[PDB]
């Protein structure tokens, strides 16, 4: 099945928890939440609690940038399990929770891992079967017969799409909120996306953090890629201001289209 291969990644990205700033407490809450089991166990197994459920977060920007920038902290030296989009259930006939059983047996054979469910839009997007396979997803996800095996970290986009019944069994450890990226979080995202690259002196920041309006990091990474290649057309690595505004027009048009 080719759909199983595109589920999770087996590489080790160099992006650590020290490459992003501003949300140090928000990243040390999940780092302290899921990095205590199976790693540094003197504060986990001596207490005698073992809540093998993990936190559930949600990113208003989404699109893998914020949620993969928070989940990437566990990807440094560990095995990872990725699940993106609820299309895999709706792109085929109602086979049922057998795919969840496959992820549960590969997670059983891969216990030192992190379960990451992304783009949770099952009920938001037959329709009567989605609710019962989602409630069955909550049933098998609760771990009624298994001991502490893996830490499940769910990640959705809108907190109102999930039914109130999917909260108490799933979210039992802790949940937090993510601030709005208007000027300073987009300034930090711009700094991280423009830390390795070289920019000119005349490149101002107020117009770049002003022309944007509710934008994630995938489009600014896309204009950093096409800006590095477009500026690379002249065999130069320096990104001028007029070329970065010419690439900024893709941002101004993309969100308005």
């Amino acid at each position: 099945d080719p759909l199983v291969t595109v589920m999770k990644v087996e590489k080790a990205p160099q992006e650590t928890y020290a490459d992003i700033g501003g949300l140090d407490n928000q990243i040390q809450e999940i780092k302290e939440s899921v990095e205590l089991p199976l790693t540094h166990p003197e504060y986990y197994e001596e207490m005698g609690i073992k809540p093998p459920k993990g936190v559930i977060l949600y990113g208003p920007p989404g699109t893998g940038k914020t949620l993969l920038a928070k989940a990437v902290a566990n990807q440094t030296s560990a095995t990872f399990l990725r699940v993106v989009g609820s299309e895999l259930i709706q792109k085929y006939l109602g086979d049922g929770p057998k795919l969840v059983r496959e992820l549960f047996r590969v997670a059983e054979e891969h216990a030192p891992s992190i379960v990451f469910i992304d783009e949770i839009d099952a009920i938001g997007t037959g329709e009567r079967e989605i609710q019962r396979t989602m409630l069955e997803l909550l049933n098998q996800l609760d771990g009624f017969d298994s001991r502490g095996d893996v830490k499940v970290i769910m990640a959705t986009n809108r907190i109102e799409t999930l039914d109130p019944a999917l909260i108490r069994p799933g979210r039992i450890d802790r949940k937090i909120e993510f601030p709005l990226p208007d000027e300073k979080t987009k300034k930090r995202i711009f700094q991280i996306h423009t830390s390795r690259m070289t920019l000119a002196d005349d490149v101002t920041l107020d117009d770049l953090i002003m022309a944007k309006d509710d934008l994630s990091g995938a489009d600014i990474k896309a204009i950093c890629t096409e800006a590095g290649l477009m500026a690379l057309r002249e065999r130069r690595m320096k990104v001028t201001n007029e070329d970065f505004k010419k690439s900024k027009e893709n941002v101004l048009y993309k969100k308005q289209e």
Binding site: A12, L38, T39, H110
Partner: protein, 686 residues
């Protein structure tokens, strides 16, 4: 520009036209020319032409080096004798003289075996010392001793770039791509320039490779003259082999100037820093002595709890959990648990006497024989524990001194060219007892005594064990563990002809031919000899299903440095012996994810020998993801060897011969449990 004014100037063969046309080519020769020197069809008449003939030879080698040639470029320069940060000198010297003198030294290095090439090589040496482009003119002038005067002519102030870069990549490509004698030139000349320079520890690695008595003397009077201490004593004793620490203690006992190198020459000052610093800053959990010491049963998992019990040498509770634990244990477990007291008492030399004396002179011969084994393991420089066992030695069939001979002769072999241990070992090997481990710990004892000697010896020691090896053709395990000590004596050199002497007087029925291929295993510690790699692939398909396991098991020793070539398609074969070859050939390295990836498939197998052999390398290569394989074995098993061996993998989880001999002797575990009595006394662990 256009060649209209200057094109009809090289056609006249007159002397003035050359003596004024050629200086214009030297002026306009800053970037060579405006094109690719298409004027060859017009200067080929000047080829035969000649007052300023050195300029004609210079321009001729300039154009021949400019377009193409193989041998005719350096001839105008070896006949020219050049005497007549810009771009000209950089172009005509740097690259044109780089490839020029490179192909001249290559053609003169391969064709013939005067001093013109020495003058060219020193001229380019100084000119490229001015150019200051390292490792490239160097990496080209490697193959042309002259390298000694080249390094001492160049190593004056640039130490970080030439030592770090040149010694790093030239040492790696000098053990990979350069043969032995030029590596010996690296050792001697590196002893020169590194003796005159700083960074003593790399010269100490040059003592790990040279094994010479003068380097440690000059580095001890120089390290003593230049003023921590216990650290370089620790890795000083770790870096030194068996030869130069007894030679070091005899020369420091001959000088006795400070007696601090005598104090650092033994095992006391390498363990007195470690034990308190390890007990203070680290605190091991007791859930593995209590847990792994609690789920034991079947009289074998309890032995795994005796080994895990031996892991402590912080917490000494499971060690001192009353008595009768050894009395309830069987013989196979009386010897292992008897050596557990030796494993748990690596320090506290003074306490070892009052801890082991309680089991000495007992009624059971195995309790006091394993107690003498403990006394031999706990000490390596005290030499005050041999007398009660070395004294009697007079049974000739069996009285407490064949098992006590295992304990004190094996533990004394671990404690150690001592002549008055072999004068007493002569009746030991000459006894020819039916017990295998007598000649086992004897050949391993004298073998580990003779490791790293002066290119070994073919004396009556290995001659005696070869004659008594071919004395009787019974119990071929003798033929399986006598080549262990034989190879321990042959170890330390590859170019020696002792392997061919064994190919002369040893070649016989495939028993001693397997002995000969074991000598071939331990006689090839590693160099650039890819002939044995293609010969390895040629003899890789031999019908004998053991010389594949050992002769192919040598892979982890031969290419132990270049770990990129070690992974191969051995796992894709169908012979289980080859799966053992790769499974043992993984090694005890840092344990990258590729290794554990190979253990994800090598682990799942149905044979108890391979399923028993996989946790040894799986858990030796990883000493995060430590508990997943143990849960995997809990899911596979839930025989006795799999459970005892997975608990011993819980033991394992949480360039010297001492880290190479024990497991190479452990490569014969597919037999009776008597070998598992020698499994509990390994010294290769860290």
């Amino acid at each position: 520009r256009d060649k209209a004014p200057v094109q009809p100037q090289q056609s006249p063969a007159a002397a003035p036209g050359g003596t004024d046309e050629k200086p214009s080519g030297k002026e306009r020769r800053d970037a060579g020319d405006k094109d690719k020197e298409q004027e060859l069809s017009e200067e080929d008449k000047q080829l035969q032409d000649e007052l300023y003939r050195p300029a004609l030879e210079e321009l001729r080698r300039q154009i021949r080096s400019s377009t193409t040639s193989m041998t005719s470029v350096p001839k105008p320069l070896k006949f020219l004798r050049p005497h007549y940060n810009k771009r000209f000198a950089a172009d005509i010297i740097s690259v044109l003289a780089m490839t020029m003198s490179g192909e001249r030294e290559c053609l003169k290095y391969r064709l013939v075996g005067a001093g013109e090439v020495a003058k060219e090589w020193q001229e380019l040496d100084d000119a490229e010392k001015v150019q200051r482009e390292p490792l490239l003119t160097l990496v080209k002038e490697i193959v042309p001793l002259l390298m000694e005067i080249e390094q001492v002519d160049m190593l004056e102030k640039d130490i970080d770039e030439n030592a770090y870069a040149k010694v790093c990549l030239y040492l790696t490509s000098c053990v990979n791509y350069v043969p032995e004698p030029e590596n010996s030139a690296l050792l001697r000349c590196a002893l020169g320039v590194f003796r005159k320079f700083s960074r003593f520890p790399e010269a100490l690695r040059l003592a790990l490779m040279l094994n010479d008595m003068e380097l440690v003397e000059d580095i001890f009077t120089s390290c003593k003259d230049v003023v921590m201490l216990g650290r370089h004593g620790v890795f000083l004793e770790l870096s030194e082999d068996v030869e130069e620490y007894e030679d070091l203690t005899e020369i420091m006992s001959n000088v006795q100037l400070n007696s601090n190198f005598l104090a650092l020459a033994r095992e006391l000052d390498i363990m007195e820093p470690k034990v308190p610093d390890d007990i203070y800053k680290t605190h091991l959990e007791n859930n593995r002595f209590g847990g792994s010491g609690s789920q034991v049963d079947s009289a074998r998992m309890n032995l795994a709890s005796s080994f895990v019990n031996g892991f402590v040498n912080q917490d000494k509770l499971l060690t001192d959990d009353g008595n009768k634990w050894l009395y309830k244990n069987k013989d196979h477990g009386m010897l292992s648990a008897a050596a557990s007291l030796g494993m748990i008492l690596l320090w506290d030399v003074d306490g070892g006497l009052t801890q082991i004396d309680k089991y000495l002179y007992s009624s059971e011969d195995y309790i006091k024989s394993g107690a003498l084994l403990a006394c031999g393991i706990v000490n390596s420089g005290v030499r005050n524990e041999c007398d009660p066992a070395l004294a009697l030695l007079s049974d000739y069939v069996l009285h407490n001194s064949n098992t006590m001979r295992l304990g004190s002769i094996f533990g004394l072999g671990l404690a150690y060219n001592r002549e008055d241990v072999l004068t007493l070992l002569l009746p030991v090997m000459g006894d020819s007892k039916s017990s295998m481990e007598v000649a086992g710990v004897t050949a391993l004892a004298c073998g580990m005594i003779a490791v790293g000697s002066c290119n070994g010896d073919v004396t009556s020691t290995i001659l005696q064990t070869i004659m008594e090896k071919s004395e009787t053709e019974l119990k071929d395990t003798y033929a399986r563990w006598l080549p262990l000590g034989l190879g321990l004596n042959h170890l330390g050199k590859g170019e020696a002809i002792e392997a061919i002497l064994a190919a002369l007087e040893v070649v016989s029925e495939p028993f001693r031919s397997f002995a000969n291929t074991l000598v071939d295993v331990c006689a090839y510690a590693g160099s650039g000899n890819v002939l044995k790699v293609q010969q390895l692939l040629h003899i890789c398909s031999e019908h004998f299903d053991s010389k594949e396991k050992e002769e192919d098991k040598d892979k982890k020793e031969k290419k132990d440095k270049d770990k990129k070539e070690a992974p191969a398609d051995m796992g894709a074969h169908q012979g289980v012996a080859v799966l053992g070859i790769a499974l043992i050939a993984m090694g005890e390295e840092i344990g990258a994810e590729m290794a554990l990836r190979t253990f994800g498939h090598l682990l799942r197998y149905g044979e108890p020998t391979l399923r028993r052999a996989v946790p040894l390398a799986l858990a030796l290569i990883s000493v995060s993801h430590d508990a997943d394989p143990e849960v995997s074995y809990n899911s596979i098993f839930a025989a006795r060897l799999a459970a005892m061996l997975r608990q011993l993998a819980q033991y394992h989880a949480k360039k010297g011969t001492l880290t190479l001999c024990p497991y190479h002797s452990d490569r014969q575990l597919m037999s009776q449990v008597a070998v598992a009595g020698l499994l509990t006394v390994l010294v290769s662990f860290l």
